Amino acid sequence: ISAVATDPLSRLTPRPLYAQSADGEAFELKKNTCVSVSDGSLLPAVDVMRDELGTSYGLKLAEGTNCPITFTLDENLDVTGHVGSAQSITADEAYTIVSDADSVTVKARSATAGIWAAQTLLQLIGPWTNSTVKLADVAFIPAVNIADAPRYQWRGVLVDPARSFYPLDEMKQMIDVMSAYKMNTLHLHLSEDEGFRVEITNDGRADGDTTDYTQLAIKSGAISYQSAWTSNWSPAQDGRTGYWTQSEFIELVAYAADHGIAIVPEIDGPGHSFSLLHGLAELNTGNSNPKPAAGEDTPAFIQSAQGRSSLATDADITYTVLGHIMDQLDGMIDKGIKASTMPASELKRMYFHLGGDQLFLSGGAGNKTERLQEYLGRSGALVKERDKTTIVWNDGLDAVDQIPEGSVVQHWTGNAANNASIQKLLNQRNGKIIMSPAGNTYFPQRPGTETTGVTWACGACTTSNFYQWNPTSSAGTTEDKVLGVEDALWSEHLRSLNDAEFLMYTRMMATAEVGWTQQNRKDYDNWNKRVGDIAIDLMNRGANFHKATEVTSWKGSYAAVDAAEQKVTDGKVLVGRYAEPGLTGTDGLSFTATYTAEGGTAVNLPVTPDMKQTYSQQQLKNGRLVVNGAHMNSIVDVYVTLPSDVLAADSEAVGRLDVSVSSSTYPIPSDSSMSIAIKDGKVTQTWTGDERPT
Template sequence: MAAIPAPSRLTPAEGRFTMTAATPLTADPPLARAAAWLRETLQPATGLPLPEGPGGIEFRLTGGLGPEEYRFTITAESVLVEATAAAGAFYGAQTLRQFLGPAAFRKGRTGTRTWTLPAATIADAPRHGWRGCLIDVARHFLPKNDLLRYIDLLAAHKLNVLHLHLTDDQGWRLEIRKYPRLTEVGSWRRESPLGAARNRRSDGRPHGGHYSQDDIREIVSYAADRFVTIVPEIDLPGHTQAAIAAYPELGNLETPLDVRTEWGVGENVLNVADSTIAFFTDVLEEVLELFPGRYVCVGGDEVPKTQWNESVPAKERIRELGLRDADELQTWLMRHFTDFLLTRGRKPLGWDELMEGGLPPGVTVAAWRGDTCAAMAARAGHDVVVQPFTETYLDFRQAEGEQEPVPIGSVTSLRAVHAFDPFPAGLTGAERDRILGAQAALWTEHIDSPRLLDYMAFPRLAAFAEAVWSGERDFEDFLARLAVHEKRLDALGVEYRPAAGPHPWQRRPDAPGHPRTRAEIDGKLAAWTANLRS
């Protein structure tokens, strides 16, 4: 019964339920989606039709449970999954699939076997409502079929938010009908760095790709069927060089730019002209058509003010508005976009740098620079999604040693991810209620293929899923369950990092990284938070 994430309460019992070709599967209408998913998912691997009918496996509507909560009872005679809402029934179906064993995760039959479920009772509910993963498709594009596969992987681990980082200096990945050059020009770059920037190597290979609007509709629909909400990110006003390369009038320079071919924080940011605000309002209009979820991320992170401090129009705008400095200018600019989203019934999400110039009201904060930022946002009355880079950035290396592919940052170990707690210390009950949950991040500067994405994500993403779903956690018990879970990942074709270290083909001696010590990272974090307090 090695379930991941661990259920809230699991009580084993005697006996096993055996599934046969005659085993029926039925559901009350509000829970039919979960039953249909289970039938569709299990049939290729088991060969069992699971026809409609009473008895056997039943999804029953019941009152009194949370929207993602479920109970189920397995006896030798029947399987009963109870839920108040479809999402809870779906998570019950995911646990049931895990109990069938790793072979249930394959897409075809691998031989004759008897399919049984161990008798048990389970009562299960998530600890946090926001259980997310950010995938950066801007730095390295993830083709549609690979993205759909990741949605299945998130759902299998009971994660319910996919934050898609769609735009950055190095690529624009979303078709915008009104501005076709965003993808014609902005979706590809002529080359990429090979390894960390200080090594001054480039691969010399063009890189690109984008999602059409029909691709996005398909992705959103596919995710919704698996109870995963897509949160799109259009990063503003920094991380915008790809957009400026496509439409130079958006920038502050008179010379044209290329899509950026270096990593790191670039100085090219949007100008503050009314026409630029109108441009990105048009972009967000199309984003709202494509993504029906409540949240839209507008970025706001890592915005150098060099160009604004030197720009005559920007300085005139600061004087005209009576602002103190360029930080307040960013707040003024971002307020246009957050107000636009709020008036359309959406919830703007932004990175915690937005607090530096005065946080626009109504913004949910993605707190990536540690507990101080998360606590400040909660105390200021803002909802918070916690995402500390020292604990949840899965592009950071997994262990010491040169064998890790493109090692950057400090070590973010499996144990550290499993121990992660989204709640900053010292919050009141009301402030803790502002913590919506947390998300892990797969930034892809140094993750240039789906195979490497697997390696960096797993098994740490499984540990993160347990950290945000389960209450009490035992790392040694998790490791014992992980040994079974890795067989499920094998069946799914996930090329995770082995506990003993990477396979030879998972190493990247051609792309040297830039490892940091934890002391270096902590020093950088302290400088950031000191600046924020000032």
């Protein structure tokens, strides 16, 4: 038996609405293959393709006229011929692909649908398109007929930088993988008891508002989740401190927009609000809790404060401050979308997340409920007057009557179908639901019984728990009331992108399928079989992931490297890469490499496999998780040593380089053949065809 590429259509995640093999040969991408667009708004889709294929395959994908690859914008694109009695789509995100040996024809209902088409094409090309080095093979798009649209319009990840900051470059790496699986929403949990993570300035304050907002990021940027206030397996390291400057936050929005992802900000209140009291002297007033000590302007960041926070629900300044933070986030979001090449009509998400987590009661100026009803009535009024829809967590529905009509609950705790408050919001107050039930969507829930993490929701919430649910059924409502789903990355215990990606992947790709794929097109075993290729692409991106035991498709894959762009050092040159999750070293890999000259016989070449990092599960030291203890092995660089007499040839020499890999941990060996040209001890050209390209 011998390793081959999976049937390209078999790879697609999320599973599209409709996908069939068309007749005949695949389309071959050439260095100079151009792309035609009907509209400038579709260039961002072409850019997503060029950003990968420029590096992996040397593709220019220049914009041209009468190109074999076309993106056409069709606001009336009709995929309903593929929507059965049992199916439901949000058509704004619909696209089609019709391809053959000669052409690839994309229609997109929106600019965002263009990017989804591009992500599908990059999956069809295969799991090496994020290669950091130019590959020797040419790229092919199979002859296919695809009609696609998502079930749910809202397919998101909550990121919590408030417990522990994530620098902009790490947020971009999350957006990359979110976009790759057609996630369209990045919910930013900007503020908590333990931090505030975006700069707020004093530009454009309301008349007579003399609040100094600049202290918010300066004081509450400098705090984070404290290891010392834990007695469990939480890392010895405190949360990362810091905040995004306005220009960093504008760049975050712009980058998200150019990948089809809208920003949804959350400023949580009246509870989980200690960062606001700690940052703004002005918010310490009326029934705020806790109070600053002996002649202090702001309460101290100390263990007794944790879970005991309340904004002043009875004070005008609370709502002045909230209004200005909302205005400033709105301004930065508009500036981010302006900096993108994507349309505001698609990427400006007219929602604001108030949170609504219960405040702590200390004094006697109201009951917890009454204060929450004051706070969400008044803060709900701010959102409505900015032409936005309010979102609250389950706790916020103690104020279901006070929040505006048409408000949204983000469900995480208990059975939504049986929740009187949720059913009243949906049924009597024209509301809608975003589904984040902890047991199906909370990344800190440990992904396996061998792992260390949060256990309360499932014991271990595996890819099975993340895949095998129906958000509409779980909400006990109709399709039209379900906006969709969000995963949650809470950062009490997270200190790095590597440790976040351990929890996020591959479970996020199950959530992506829940958000996108039709309920009657879902098949956990089929999704499980696609994870092998998902992992090969994550390894190419340098993204970490949990090597879950329930995944049956972990595989090795070999790709020939274009040695023409690699240096020969002491006769050694990089000719291949071998990706296989879980390698603890290279000694379980058996490589055979031969060079066969024109005129020659097979010459065995010494093979030098090189793997920078080895695979490790999580590591505990003194009862606590080590930061980055769980890490994936590197892709193996496969070097051969070329013979001295081939490298000393004053005349060009052509030969065939055949590389075989057998793995102790993956039972299907790979075979690779490419032709190489060598002159003056350097590889000048490689090719995998029967004909040398000219």
